[PDB]
Amino acid sequence: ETILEVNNVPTNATSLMERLRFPVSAQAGKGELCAVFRADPGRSGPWQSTLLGQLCGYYTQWSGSLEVTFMFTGSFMATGKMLIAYTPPGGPLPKDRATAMLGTHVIWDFGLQSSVTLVIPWISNTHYTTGLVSIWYQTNYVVPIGAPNTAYIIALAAAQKNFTMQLCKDASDIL
Amino acid sequence: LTIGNSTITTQEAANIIVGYGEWPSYCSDSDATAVDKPTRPDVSVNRFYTLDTKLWEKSSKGWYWKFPDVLTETGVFGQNAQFHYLYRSGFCIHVQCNASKFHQGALLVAVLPEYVIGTVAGGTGTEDSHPPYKQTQPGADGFELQHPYVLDAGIPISQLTVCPHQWINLRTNNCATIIVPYINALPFDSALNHCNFGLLVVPISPLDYDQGATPVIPITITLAPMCSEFAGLRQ
Amino acid sequence: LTIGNSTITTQEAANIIVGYGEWPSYCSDSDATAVDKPTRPDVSVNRFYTLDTKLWEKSSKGWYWKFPDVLTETGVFGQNAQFHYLYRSGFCIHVQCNASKFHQGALLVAVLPEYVIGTVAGGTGTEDSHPPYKQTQPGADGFELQHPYVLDAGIPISQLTVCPHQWINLRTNNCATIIVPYINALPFDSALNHCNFGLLVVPISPLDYDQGATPVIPITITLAPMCSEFAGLRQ
Amino acid sequence: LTIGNSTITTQEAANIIVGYGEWPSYCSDSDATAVDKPTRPDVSVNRFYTLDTKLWEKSSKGWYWKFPDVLTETGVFGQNAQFHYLYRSGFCIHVQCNASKFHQGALLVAVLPEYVIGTVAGGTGTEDSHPPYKQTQPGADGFELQHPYVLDAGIPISQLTVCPHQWINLRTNNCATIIVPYINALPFDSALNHCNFGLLVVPISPLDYDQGATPVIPITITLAPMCSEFAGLRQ
Amino acid sequence: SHSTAETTLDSFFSRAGLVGEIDLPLEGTTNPNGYANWDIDITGYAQMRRKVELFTYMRFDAEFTFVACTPTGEVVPQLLQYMFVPPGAPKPDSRESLAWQTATNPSVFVKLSDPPAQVSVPFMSPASAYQWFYDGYPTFGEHLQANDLDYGACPNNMMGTFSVRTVGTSKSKYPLVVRIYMRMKHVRAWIPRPMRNQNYLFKANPNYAGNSIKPTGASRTAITT
Amino acid sequence: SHSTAETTLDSFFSRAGLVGEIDLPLEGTTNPNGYANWDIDITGYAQMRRKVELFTYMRFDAEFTFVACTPTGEVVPQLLQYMFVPPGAPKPDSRESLAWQTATNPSVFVKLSDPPAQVSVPFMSPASAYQWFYDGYPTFGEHLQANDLDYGACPNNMMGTFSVRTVGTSKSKYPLVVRIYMRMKHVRAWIPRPMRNQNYLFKANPNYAGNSIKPTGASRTAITT
């Protein structure tokens, strides 16, 4: 299990650390928070942060299943609900929250504080469109007085026993 | 209950409570009640249909739902109940509100069979009647009551507890779960035309915070329909 | 673990985690690896050396330690490791932070064998190199990182978890404990000249309070070195 | 066959002939092909889908279909493969034509796996390409051939019988039945993007009547998909 | 004549065939670069395409041999480089490219004095079998109207591509000609198809002319032999 | 694709890689002597450094190959000498030095006419395993303050160096280019590390820039794909 930089947005070294992290706040309610983007490691993107995503760059095409656990960093007294929904390849991004409920999806409550594991069944490279995981405000981030009205989540991922890789492939960074 | 997609794990105190004392059953059909025999497994369409989560303010006056209705463009159930000739099903619904140990209020999740909710307007000034079309077909989002003391129905909540009910006191329980069987004169009725059933969420202690805390409290509704009745038709 | 002076009692969830899956062992010496045989009991010098407790602010960017180093004028271990010819030992370290159920943040206590931490300056304006002397011999107090994303080492924390690690989420655990065995090419090396080992404390969620609460959060470090290797020398 | 709705009565002559000698099978899953485990009854989706019946004149030159496509907004089968990411199924198709005992002609119902049908136009006077988009996703209605001798593929019917075939000679049979299994390099592909499979209805003896008898000949097509593969998704 | 060995797919395919003739002039208008990439198509050997379009799906390894000479045929003391790059790997762009040192791009160094090099490329596809034409759009998902001729074409049907160089920082001394030969080995095929009868237009679709010819004529009438 | 074989350390490393490019022109300004020592860096193959700093400790034999040619690519009837000298042994200083005759410095004599030489260098380290970086001063005993930048480099990790000559009492006649390729054999690795993300400055310390780049960007916002 290694960190997935879903918030692959800022390029400032002081805010370069904000990449691992992605926010939730008491502001927006039941609307839309974040799709963790593609469920594809080797495609240029957020997965390049993972150890998995990098070694996939050292090969060509793979087949397997992944598990992506999310971790909540908010206060103890903080509470709320989130539904995480995977959208398989081909299908466009779900129109709304309720649309995500009609498929494979998991409502995450902060009662089961520790974490919540999302297992994506199958992804493959046949070199586009891949699976999508979207995280929705089932409800807003409610907090009592004394709790920060905004909180942060870390997403870290890895591969299961069915993960296999292809032929060696080289493409680096250095000169 | 491991029937459906994703649940929510709880330390679940005995918040379990069955409608009138009998569990949801199927249909007894070894006579001539229907010569065609509808066949349906338990986890095909018993997905956890969770409506959109609603807010609970201090000036809130309670909300209601109808169950044969609530599924329209809602779920593969609605893609099934709208085209189907006749309908029947039981339900397992779990009302959960997420709040702080600093917020206080009092909820009554209650279940009411035949819910004819009124209604009235002013007087004889412009029109004499016309209760709303949207009284029926209330969406998942809707709807607010108008006079909670009478449920807009000329009947006091003071005695609603005679119906299968369950309390949500933010002092103690954040979760309440109530299971309802089927309840009708005919063993098989039609769906969208008659809302066989009504769900109520009425506040008694209208919630109170001390500011600096989110004034909005989430009431996430989660539904699980048991003992449905279908087969298939046209389109 | 009742080996040393004073411990700290916890309801200790399974925060126990061993380096790479094998417990700290001793030295296998029935050949000719050393003709002199060092002898050492387990509780003489395995005192709980707790460094000074450090603060955790919002603008904190993580801290690191080196273990053969950390003992210099530190403990009877340093009075032992500095005069001794060669060194070897395992460790049991317990990182504990004391915070409120109102403070939130995210820590990654992680362990890294060979820690060569850089470093770089500006460019070719005044001098071209000179990484610091105090890079080595970091005192108990020190030291802050410079670029946590690269650990000042050109290597992303994003994948540090491949090393024996443990999370401290102030939502759940206030304590994390990680045990490390010895890890080196030679079964016996020298001490203060080579820091065999590095300890990391990196924040991911940079802590947040809502004011009126102590903006400083204590990370008390407690160390317990197992399977040392000594005998005695001169002065 | 007690799987489906309504049949067409036969004395059940042996016009049955299977693709390559093996029945359509299911999936072998005691390995790691899918962490999701498919669940499926024998009579759920196997309704007898009969497409529109098309006419057959003297100047007829044959028609063709593609199968993974033909059900898209067609029947509850297409509403399922369109919503599902991936697909697999076998088919049992019964091509039946209604004619007089005074009519004469010869049809060859044949089945061809990968049917990439061309094609060419006038030339390069105004445009160099334009293959039709509507070539694929052929509705029940389509399609007419263009050059039956080469199947618009530069490939002779002269050897078409090398593929799964069945004859319709009005001397004997007005009915023909052919069964096809799943056939692909990958065990699971998508539907509407790739037509894995093609059906041909080509005349050799181009029909002849002596007029005063209905000159239009009905070829009613009836399909029955076996060993499908789905589960359910979103909407 | 009871013997079925010459009717095996293997015997039907096991033969080193010329599929590549690579030109490196001293200078000219072919490639002033001194460098050439050869996408590894079997259709280069003309008759082979009809010979294999007998089937839908098939599978094979490939034995490659590289005989190189001058256009005269003079064997010449030049040391050259054959480079095979996998489907994933990028193809080299320049003579001075970075791709030549890329390890996952296997390279072969021989002299012309040394007998022709010989290597074997196995079955590369991510599918269970190769496919000569895919009755669908090779794009996954909903269609984009950027491309519409990639029809029938299977992209993972590509088994890589070959690159050739005269080794060295400086230009070659001699005009050389490399010829590329393909041998097919462990073959398994599947769904049988009727064999081609019309002439080909392209090498990506069974396109044909707007006027059909007939595989045999000149018969006068059916009664007279 | 059920095989973990290409995820084996051997397969991850099993490929002869170019690590050295030594030029001996007839005369110029590079090295006019006809003599060259090549300190044996593995980092010569560019990408290899990040690829091995995946681990802390590892261990392996090394198979070296020597393909030599002219810049022309002309194979030339020249007899040359490859000499491997151990870490302890001194390196030759002049073309007419004695070190060329030091027997315990193994030598290889081949012609360019002779196909590329192939030798194998075993695990040389005095440690139980190789080591990529030493978090200490490489001096035994307390350090002398001559050093200010000598940090991290492991001296007993040095596996020797290769030296090349144009054999003969007199200077070479032909312009030559020797190329060195490395393949790693019986590989065993140990402690896993996160992989490099920034560019390297030196090959004696994992130093980084005073301005960090990002291993993946151009993402606009977390909501937009």
The residues spanned by each domain of chain A are 1-175
A2 DSSP β-pair partners: A157
Q: Which among C159, C171, C206 is the nearest to A76, CB-wise?
A: C171
- Host H or E run for residue A7: none
**Beta strands C104-112; F188-189: pairing state:** unpaired
Structure tokens at D39: 């669940």
The Cα-based distances of E65 to A27, E75, E177, F113 in angstroms read 68, 17, 14, 22
**Sign (positive or negative) of CA dihedral D95, D99, D102, D103:** negative
Amino acid at C35: V
∠ CA C58-F221-D233, rounded to 5°:
115
Element (H, E) at A70: strand A63-72
DSSP F218: -
**Gap between the Cα atoms of B177 and B8, Å rounded:** 12
In degrees rounded to 5, what are phi and psi of residue D118?
110, -140
Choose among E224, F131, D96, B135: nearest CA to C189: F131
Specify the residue for token string 């995480």: A84
Of all residues in chain A, the one with the smallest CA distance to F219 is: A9
Cβ of A91 and D235 within 8 Å?
A: no
Cβ separation D233–A100 shorter than 8 A: no
What is the distance between the alpha carbons of residues B58 and B204, in angstroms, rounded to a whole number?
11
Structure tokens given for C103: 């403070």
**C168 CB near a chain A CB, below 8 Å?**
no
- 3-state class (DSSP) for residue F112: coil
| C-alpha neighbours within 13 Å on the C-beta side of residue B18 | 10
- A85 beta partners: A105, A134
Residue E120 makes CB contacts below 8 A (sequence gap 6+) with E61, E62, E63, E64, E185
- Residue F16's identity, in one-letter code, is A
Report the chain E residue with the minimal C-alpha distance to residue F19: E101
Q: How many Å separate Cα A128 from the centre of its chain?
A: 19
**∠ CA(A18), CA(A23), CA(A27), 5° rounding?**
145
Q: Do E206 and D196 touch (CB under 8 A)?
A: no
Nearest CA-CA distance, residue F18 and chain E, Å: 7
Smallest Cα distance from A71 to chain C, Å: 9
Q: Which of D114, E78, D199, C123 is nearest to F73 (CA)?
A: E78
Q: Which of B8, B220, B222 sits opposite A139 (nearest CB)?
A: B220
How far is C226 from C92, CA to CA, in rounded Å?
A: 7
Which of D178, D201, D195 is CA-nearest to residue D115? Answer: D195
Tokens 């206590």 sit at which residue?
C109
From chain E, the residues in CB contact with A172 under 8 A are: none
Q: Using CB atoms, which chains have 3+ pairs under 8 A with F?
A: A, C, E
- Separate counts of helices (H) and strands (E) for chain A: 2, 9
Omega of the bond leading into D119 within 30 degrees of 0 (cis) = yes
CA angle E177, E181, E187 (to 5 degrees): 165
- Give the span between the Cα atoms of F62 and F13, in whole angstroms: 11
Contacts of C122 in chain F (CB under 8 A): 210
Q: Which of A5, A113, A152 sits opposite C205 (nearest CB)?
A: A152
Which CATH number is F1-225's, of 3.20.20.80, 1.10.357.10, 2.60.120.20, 2.60.120.1310? 2.60.120.20
Tell me if E215 and D185 make a contact (CB, 8 A cut-off): no
Spell out the residues 6+ positions from residue B35 whose beta carbon is closer than 8 angstroms to its own: none
Give the distance from CA F80 to its chain's centroid: 21
Report CB contact under 8 Å: C130, F149: yes
Token pair for A34 = 């974040």
Tokens of D89: 């199924």
Asked whether the beta carbons of E207 and E149 are under 8 A apart, the reply is no
Cβ contact A20–C170 (<8 Å):
no
SS (H, E, C) E153-178: CCHHHCCCEEEEEECCCCCCCCCEEE
Classify residue E130 as left (phi > 0), alpha (psi -120 to 50) or beta: beta
**Is the Cβ of C161 closer than 8 Å to some Cβ of chain A?**
yes
Looking at residue C152, the DSSP 8-state letter turns out to be T
Cα E127 to chain center, whole Å? 19
Where do runs of H (alpha helix) occur along chain D?
A: 67-70, 75-81
Beta bridge partners, D90, equal D226
Chains A & E: contacts with CB separation below 8 Å: 44
The alpha carbon torsion through C62, C68, C70, C72 (nearest 10 deg) reads -160
Residue in F163, F9, F145, F153 with CA at minimum distance from that of residue F89: F163
- The Cβ of residue D16 has, within 10 Å, a number of other Cβ atoms equal to 13
Distance CA B226, CA E12 (A): 63
Residue-wise DSSP of C2-59: --SS--------S---BGGG--------SSSS-SS-----SSSS---B----B---TT
* Cα D136 off chain centre by: 13
- Cα separation, F206 vs C119, whole angstroms: 8
Q: How far is D65 from chain E (nearest CA, A)?
A: 12
Q: Which residues of A touch F (CB under 8 A)?
A: 5-9, 11, 13, 16, 19, 22, 32-35, 37-38, 44-49, 51, 54-55, 58-59, 62-63, 93, 132, 164-168, 170, 172-175
| Residue B124 vs residues B121, B130, B135: alpha-carbon distances, Å | 9, 12, 21
Q: Does D185 touch chain A (CB under 8 A)?
A: no
Q: Which of D76, D169, F16, C223 is nearest to B83 (CA)?
A: D76
Closest chain C C-alpha to A30 CA, distance in angstroms: 23
Q: Which of F124, F36, F29, F21 is closest to F81 using CA atoms?
A: F36
CA distance E155 to E207: 19
Nearest to A106, CA basis, from A114, A94, A118, A115? A118
CB contact under 8 A, E194 and D156: yes
Pairing of strands A150-159, A2-3: antiparallel
**CA F44/CA F22 separation, integer angstroms:** 12
Cα(B205)–Cα(E41) distance, integer angstroms? 78
Strand (E) positions, D21-174? Answer: 49-50, 63-66, 90-97, 104-112, 165-169
Q: Does D6 touch chain B (CB under 8 A)?
A: no
d(CA A62, CA A92): 23
* CB F200, CB A174: distance < 8 Å: yes
Looking at residue B97, which CATH number applies to its domain? 2.60.120.20
Nearest CB neighbour to D235, from listed B44, B76, B232: B76
CB B201 within 8 A of CB B219: yes
d(CA D132, CA D146): 14
Interface probe with F: pick from E167, E172, E174, E178, most Cβ of F within 10 Å: E167
| Partner D contacted by B235 (CB < 8 A) | yes
Q: How many CA atoms lie within 13 A of D42 on its CB side?
A: 3
Contact indicator for C203, C59 with CB cutoff of 8 Å: no
Q: Check CB contact of B5 with chain D, cutoff 8 Å.
A: no
Cα-flanking dihedrals φ and ψ of residue E57, to 5°?
Answer: -110, 140
B79 touches chain D (CB under 8 A): yes
Instruction: Sort out which chain A residues have CB atoms less than 8 A from B140's CB and list them.
Output: 98
Q: Which helix (H) or strand (E) holds A106?
A: strand A105-109
Quickly count: other Cβ atoms within 10 Å of residue E6's Cβ.
9
F6 contacts A168? CB cut-off 8 A: yes
SS (H, E, C) chain B: CCCCCCCCCCCCCCCCCEHHHCCCCCCCCCCCCCCCCCCCCCCCCCCCECCCCECCCCCCCCEEEEHHHHCCCCHHHHHHHCCCCCECCEEEEEEEECCCCCCEEEEEEEEECCCCCCCCCCCCCCCCCCCCHHHCCCCCCCCECCCCCCCCCCCCHHHHHHCCEEEEECCCCCEEEEEECCCCCCCCECCCCCCCCEEEEEEEEEEECCCCCCCCCCEEEEEEEECCCCCCCCC
Cβ contact A172–F46 (<8 Å): yes
Helix, strand, or coil (residue D79): helix
Return phi, psi of residue C122, to 5°: -80, -85
Q: Among F81, F79, F65, F34, which residue's Cα sits nearest to residue F175?
A: F34
Number of domains making up chain C: 1
> CA B204, CA B105: separation in Å to the nearest integer?
7
Q: CA-CA distance, E138 to F94, in Å (whole number)?
A: 63
Among E151, E212, E47, smallest CA distance to D118 is for E151
Sheet holding F35-39, edge to edge: F35-39, F161-166, F79-85, F107-111
Chain breaks in chain A (C to N over 2.5 A) after: 127
Determine contact: B76 vs chain D, CB below 8 A.
yes
Whole-number Å distance between alpha carbons of A142 and A79:
6
Phi, psi of E213 (to 5 degrees): -95, 175
Contact A90 E142 (CB under 8 A): yes
Domain extent at residue B165: 1-235
Contacts of C155 (CB under 8 A, 6+ apart): F193, F194, F195, F196, F197, F206
State whether F73 and E166 contact (CB < 8 Å): yes
Task: Please answer yes or no on whether C155 and F196 come within 8 Å at the CB atom.
Answer: yes
- According to DSSP, the residues that pair with B65 across neighbouring strands are B199
Chain B residues inside the 8 Å CB shell of A79 = 98-100
CA distances from B49 to A50, A64, D204 (A): 34, 30, 57
| Chains A+C touching (3+ CB pairs under 8 Å) | yes
- In this complex, the residue of D154, D162, D186 whose CB is nearest that of residue E127 is D186
| C147–chain F Cβ distance below 8 A for any pair | yes
Q: Which residues pair with B86 in a beta bridge?
A: none
Could E127 and D185 be called an inter-chain contact, meaning their C-beta atoms sit closer than 8 Å? yes
CA distance F44 to F46: 6
Q: Do A140 and B101 touch (CB under 8 A)?
A: no
Q: Are F62 and F161 in contact (CB under 8 A)?
A: no
D147/E206 Cβ within 8 A: no
Q: Does domain A1-175 have CATH number 3.30.2130.10?
A: no
Query: In which residue are the tokens 């799943």 written?
Result: D182
Q: Tokens 């008694």, residue? A: B204
Method of determination is X-ray
Which of C149, C162, C171 is the closest to A74 by Cβ? Answer: C171
Closest Cα in chain D, distance from residue E72 (Å): 41
The shortest C-alpha distance from E193 to chain F (Å) reads 29
Chain C residues in contact with F131 by the CB 8 A cut-off are 114, 185
CB contact under 8 A, A73 and C156: no
